Motif scaffolding. Structure first.
Motif, PDB file in Angstrom:
ATOM      1  N   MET C 174      35.657  48.380  42.919  1.00 52.86           N
ATOM      2  CA  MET C 174      36.864  47.801  42.356  1.00 52.86           C
ATOM      3  C   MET C 174      37.012  48.249  40.915  1.00 52.86           C
ATOM      4  O   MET C 174      36.023  48.371  40.187  1.00 52.86           O
ATOM      5  CB  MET C 174      36.839  46.280  42.421  1.00 52.86           C
ATOM      6  N   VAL C 175      38.253  48.483  40.511  1.00 55.31           N
ATOM      7  CA  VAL C 175      38.580  48.886  39.153  1.00 55.31           C
ATOM      8  C   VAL C 175      39.111  47.662  38.426  1.00 55.31           C
ATOM      9  O   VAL C 175      40.132  47.086  38.818  1.00 55.31           O
ATOM     10  CB  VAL C 175      39.601  50.027  39.129  1.00 55.31           C
ATOM     11  N   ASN C 176      38.425  47.264  37.363  1.00 59.28           N
ATOM     12  CA  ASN C 176      38.910  46.185  36.520  1.00 59.28           C
ATOM     13  C   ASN C 176      40.072  46.692  35.666  1.00 59.28           C
ATOM     14  O   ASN C 176      40.594  47.791  35.867  1.00 59.28           O
ATOM     15  CB  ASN C 176      37.772  45.637  35.664  1.00 59.28           C
ATOM     16  N   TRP C 179      38.094  48.768  32.392  1.00 56.13           N
ATOM     17  CA  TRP C 179      36.679  48.890  32.079  1.00 56.13           C
ATOM     18  C   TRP C 179      35.933  49.765  33.074  1.00 56.13           C
ATOM     19  O   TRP C 179      34.733  49.996  32.894  1.00 56.13           O
ATOM     20  CB  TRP C 179      36.033  47.503  32.036  1.00 56.13           C
ATOM     21  N   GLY C 180      36.607  50.245  34.114  1.00 58.33           N
ATOM     22  CA  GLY C 180      36.009  51.165  35.046  1.00 58.33           C
ATOM     23  C   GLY C 180      35.620  50.510  36.351  1.00 58.33           C
ATOM     24  O   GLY C 180      35.795  49.305  36.551  1.00 58.33           O
ATOM     25  N   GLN C 194      30.276  42.660  35.789  1.00 56.67           N
ATOM     26  CA  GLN C 194      31.602  42.530  35.199  1.00 56.67           C
ATOM     27  C   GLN C 194      32.714  42.690  36.223  1.00 56.67           C
ATOM     28  O   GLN C 194      33.827  43.100  35.867  1.00 56.67           O
ATOM     29  CB  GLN C 194      31.776  43.556  34.081  1.00 56.67           C
ATOM     30  N   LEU C 195      32.442  42.381  37.488  1.00 54.33           N
ATOM     31  CA  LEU C 195      33.387  42.715  38.547  1.00 54.33           C
ATOM     32  C   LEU C 195      34.703  41.969  38.379  1.00 54.33           C
ATOM     33  O   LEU C 195      35.781  42.567  38.453  1.00 54.33           O
ATOM     34  CB  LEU C 195      32.763  42.409  39.904  1.00 54.33           C
TER      35      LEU C 195
ATOM     36  N   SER F 113      46.911  58.040  35.170  1.00 58.43           N
ATOM     37  CA  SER F 113      45.576  58.625  35.248  1.00 58.43           C
ATOM     38  C   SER F 113      44.787  58.190  34.019  1.00 58.43           C
ATOM     39  O   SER F 113      45.070  58.638  32.902  1.00 58.43           O
ATOM     40  CB  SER F 113      45.650  60.146  35.358  1.00 58.43           C
ATOM     41  N   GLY F 114      43.806  57.312  34.227  1.00 59.26           N
ATOM     42  CA  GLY F 114      42.965  56.827  33.157  1.00 59.26           C
ATOM     43  C   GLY F 114      41.713  57.669  33.013  1.00 59.26           C
ATOM     44  O   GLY F 114      41.319  58.391  33.925  1.00 59.26           O
TER      45      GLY F 114
END
Lengths: 293, 293, 293, 293, 293, 293
Positions: C174-176, C179-180, C194-195, F113-114
């Motif tokens: 999953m993308v926050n 924050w990646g 940090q999910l 696009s990050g």
């Protein structure tokens, strides 16, 4: 297409409202390792001026990528296929003709992206002691980048005639593990031809320093399976309604010799060392609409 | 295609205006963990010179990615599938032949983008005290970038014959969490083979340092589901209208041994440690157009 | 495809010139929050050797992403779905078999673009006082870039049998906010997992520091709607033409505990904390071609 | 399309509910190395105001890329095809007309990507002795990049008439091993024309310093296979229902002369050195709807 | 589309279950070098409120890119087509109307990619003598890049009426060898207009310094082949069932004058120097459903 | 689609096995420069609960981009279209309703696009006198790039009702020669609005400093050709089977005033200066299934 000339699609095509006589002819040449199949279709379109025979050569020509000779731990030899070929040839005395064929030599391309780009930068550096110094930079970007698809094997239609037609599959380039492309003509003075060298400074015997066929293109090890259509045409009024057609499969095997220099490995490539041909003659009966061997 | 030779599409194909006899044959080998299915279709096209049987091998070959042995907290062993295989073999004394098959070994490619690009820059730096100094730079960009699709598993058509045909699914490369691709032959002197190592300096016992199958390709854990078609052809005039065909599924399991060096973890890969074969013999009745086990 | 073996498309398929008996079976499990639907199709193709039942499991398995417990302003707990599952199981004593299924485990890939590129630059700087000084630079560009699609949830076909089949939808990444990516196993010593943390140094109570479900994948909040087909096959000659099939839906809910360290927030993830199963038994009547609950 | 004007697709097209008379006419000119085929289709649509003849010129015009003369180890000459041509010409006294044709001169394009981009950087360097010094840089990126497909050979429709039509395939650019594109007009004062030079400082005789045809486009060696449709139209009321049409194939061969300068190799290109024409006259009978030679 | 409003596709279209009367009208204007064709289709849909005539203007308007005048080795003149045009005009006294047309002025676009990107760098240089010095750099990337297709020639629908309609093909930009795009309005104080200059400092006479037409777009040399549909509509109750329609083709030729400055070459472009018009009047008979000239 | 709910495609659509009454209604407003066409289709599907009328507004709304006033060599004025509009309005007392319409307001997107990328570099410089000095650099790349298609003109569906519906085509952005995008609200303190300024420091009179319409979007000069479908629905039982529908076309023309500052040119844009409306009332007869003006 036929639509671009304001004609309903499929109108000018053949095979509408006619009975087609199909057939398969299979045979395996163990010595040459070839599974040969011929899918033939007889078409007698009463509105067409000739009888058509569609001959689709198919099967599989085993690559036979294999180590063939070992003279010790310092030398070894690999038989690897550099080319496959399929040829259909009618005897010169026949009345039939090779009207059509497929695939053909499609015109390829290379995406050419040219550059005409300008950059400008203005730097003005300074120090805390009160000293400023700067520059203005103008940068030009020009040239071209060429990008295209580079397949391992090409397919080519050899110059055909009204009696002979032929396709050849040719080795163009191969990508090793990560050392880059290599061809039959590649030559490094240090390593010679690095086409199939697993490692440059290997401690194993030469026979074990060859690329694993799984890594390499499956055309080399398992083989190549053609699907090549040819269209023979005969005049209905011809007295001789029987013909003989020679279907030929070929595997050209090159010799990759690997040698130990006492420092590193060197590879040499002898082209067209062996040529394995499997030729069959098929009797075509245009009246009974059949083909036999 | 048949349109490219000026022939109406689908004219030379088989199965037009004929009755096709289909069937399913299912069976589960618990010991080898294989769900085997055969979808058979009998085609007797009166215009075709032979009877056709289309045999589609399907099902699922469970990968059985699993920890098999633990000798403590420092050593562990993983059985992981490196290859699946499907083989259809006719006895040499049969009159039938393996006319066709699918999929085949499609010719792949690597997008090769070459560079011939020129840059020029002109810098002229200056100071507030009255000092100018500059340069003119010519920069050349050349070389090549190779880009292609790198799948985890390849599908390959083993060299076929008129009696035997076979596909093999092979492990090519795997991408770990973010450490990059790894193959069966990868070897790091420090960590050995990092193919399935969850961590390099883990504090957990070896059995728990293996990649979670969910992260890895589902072919390893859940398995692989083939869809492989073969086309048998028989002559109508053959006296013996019954045949026996051996359908074989195989799972090749390699052993990934994980060891503790008292400093970090090391991985070794023993190839083809186990081979799990499930072979069935199917009776083909060409007169009643059926298949049985 | 069937065209690649010279067979007219759709010839070997089932369902041609036959009457198909369809039906829907719906039911809502409020406690487990599941809308279950079964779309069944009975196919009795006289040319096929068995009766076919196509069972398409559909509906919606509500994710129920929700805060479940609050112990104050410093701690909170989130129930979030990590996996959905659908299973069709026949009792071992039945004569029927799970012939086919869809979707399956398609072989994925990662676009691998390697680099072998050379750059050369020639700088020759000079000053107005008569001082020249220069360099020639050769630069090598090598390595690889791996690019592929990384979906939030994977769909997987669990190892099937002749009596059991099952799909599982799994949380992959999953993308926050920005924050990646984060997964169930992600662990930062500072922030833990940090999910689902809206902020790292938030002043709001823990229950309010969780990601808004709208930002996150709708599979977590609204749920997942399967469309999974299975193909049961029965022999016409079997004396017992009635079967019982168990359709099972599952939601695996993990616990995301958020804690206040008096400095920043920390997140922990307990896997498979809860498992919500909804199982129904469907009576299949192959003679009347119907299904009931 | 006809749908964009609210008209059912295919309604305005020709060939609906009519009988079409097709035919093939084949012949091989050995001297000029041309396999000529004409696929003709007669269409008499009672709702159309004229009789239509669709003439598809096909076959293969062998490139005949070949070394033709050697004067020793320092000089050699290559005959290479720079252009193919196909022309259909009706005599000026005929009542028929060239109504339509395909392919035509499609309007091409070049992807033009312009740049208006701003960068800013702020550097502030410092030393451990207490000295700070910095700069602020503003950088402008502007210009354009032009990217398009650059094929080896173009296809062109020569200015047609009501009696003459013609296509020409032209050599545009060729990519050598990795030395970049080259055309017929390329000229390097050092090497002259590097179009077909295998190497610049080769030690082999000139005849062996030419590019292998396999590396080069197959149009040069194996040849080019046209598929060019023309649509003749005749009025039903014309008294003379017989016509004569001249079908012409041409191969333009240029001479690539390779010379040894005692230092390196130089290449020169003489354009249109040879022109190989094969013309046939076909009798068209509009009443019997046939074509003959 | 008609499906997006819940209406079966093709239901609202015209031409269903009706007989369509087609025809071709061809003629070649040698003086203006135009091959004019009109493909007409009469549609009398009893369910439609009017009779429809679909007039597709086709053919080829030869570009006639050619050197027309030479005043010596220092001056030359090129006639090059800057625009083609096709116009269908009904006399103002007619009852018929221009109901529809195609192609139209499709709304184009430019791919706009904006940038909001941040970079940070931390450098800390040191020497072996014990001197450390460093910087922290924050870099901002912003702006936009605009990328779109830039074709050589545009196609435009001139403002139509109920009596007049017209398309114009316009020269937009041309790419020289590698010097970049050029248009009719380009003007360099040094070289003037570099649109068709083969070289800037050529030693050949002006007539030989023009771009080879093969390099340039084939629209300039061979010509442009329109395919432009118009839909006339007439009321069945109109007493006058005969009309006269003027079909007009135009080629606008500009003059590119090349001059020698005794230092380099200069080019000037005189717009719309010549205009070559070919107008034909076609008699339309709506009762017999025919068109004549 | 209807297939995604397990329903055969086209089953729920309208118009199956029914007779549709089509028609065209054309008229040209010379004063407002509008070619108005209405393509109407009456559908009486006996299985549908209402009578349907599909009204496709089409034609061309000439942009009329033109210089309208000149006050000398220093000032000029351009009328340019900023918006087109099409409205169909039923009187409030009618029983009919605007059931459907097309096109609608499709949800657009911007490719986001990050970046989360890390670079590391290690430099260690040295001199021939024995002095080494080095640095280790860690570089962070972050942010986002937004890329999407930016068309010149948007198409929008104004808030509809059961009596009124309307589309508006709006000017969004325009790209000048190479100076970048400009909109109606763009304002430079130096040059004002640079939307249609050919040059900033031109020596020609203002009227000649405007962009050539050929360079600009053809919507401005030649015009815009709508294709907008609306679906009226009426109840069969309604006593009044006649309705009146107002079809309205609008062109909003803005004034671009160009002024000379004695230093450079300045441009101002007055919005919605003129509004050109062409309204027609069409009588709809639902019993005879016709429309008239």
């Amino acid at each position: 297409a036929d639509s671009d000339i304001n004609i309903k699609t499929g109108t000018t095509d053949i095979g509408s409202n006619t009975t087609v006589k199909t057939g398969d002819l299979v045979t395996y040449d163990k010595e040459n390792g070839m599974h040969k199949k011929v899918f033939y279709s007889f078409i007698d379109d009463k509105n067409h001026n000739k009888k058509l025979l569609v001959i689709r050569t198919k099967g599989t020509i085993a690559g036979q990528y294999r180590v063939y000779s070992e003279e010790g731990a310092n030398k070894s030899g690999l038989a690897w296929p550099s080319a496959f070929k399929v040829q259909l040839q009618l005897p010169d005395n026949e009345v039939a003709q090779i009207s059509d064929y497929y695939p053909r030599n499609d015109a390829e391309f290379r995406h050419d992206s040219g550059y005409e780009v300008h950059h400008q930068k203005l730097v003005f550096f300074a120090e805390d002691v009160g000293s400023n110094k700067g520059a203005i930079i103008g940068l030009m970007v020009g040239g071209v980048v060429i990008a295209y698809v580079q397949p391992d094997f090409k397919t080519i239609l050899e110059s055909p005639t009204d009696k002979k037609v032929g396709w050849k599959v040719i080795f163009n380039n191969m990508v090793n593990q990560n050392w880059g492309p290599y061809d039959r003509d590649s030559w490094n003075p240090v390593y010679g031809n690095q086409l199939f060298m697993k490692t440059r400074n290997g401690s194993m015997k030469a026979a074990d320093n060859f690329l694993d066929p799984n890594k390499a293109s499956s055309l080399l090890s398992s083989g190549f399976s053609p699907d090549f259509a040819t269209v023979i045409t005969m005049d209905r009024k011809a007295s001789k309604q029987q013909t003989n057609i020679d279907v030929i499969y070929e595997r050209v095997r090159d010799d990759y010799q690997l040698h130990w220099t006492s420092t590193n490995w060197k590879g040499t490539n002898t082209k067209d060392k062996w040529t394995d041909r499997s030729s069959e003659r098929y009797k075509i009966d245009w009246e009974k609409e059949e083909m036999t061997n």
